[PDB]
Every structure is written in C-alpha cells, then in structure tokens.
Design a protein around this ligand. Sequence first.
Ligand SMILES: [Cl-]
Length: 51
Amino acid sequence: VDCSEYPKPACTLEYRPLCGSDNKTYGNKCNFCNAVVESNGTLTLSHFGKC
Ligand SMILES: [Cl-]
C-alpha cells in the first residue's frame, strides 16, 4: 500500500484494522504506515482486516 504521506505525527481514532507482516493488527492505515517508516521499510501489509 502507498505510505507516501507518512510518517504523520498523530493518527486518528478511526478503527480500520490491517494486518502487518509482523502479525500485529494495526488500528488503521496511519498507524500501519508510521510503523512501516519506523521499520525502515521491513514491515509490509499482509492483508486488510484483523490478523
Ligand atoms: Cl469482527
């Protein structure tokens, strides 16, 4: 997924789960993309929805 607009200093509370390649269910795209940046691009998206 496109994380170009990230990192962002805050994420909203909109709960739209997505499952990272680490088997964490991130709360929304903002939280996931911030983690992708934090990971130096090693985290990817497994699927939308809960792991
Ligand atoms: Cl459910």
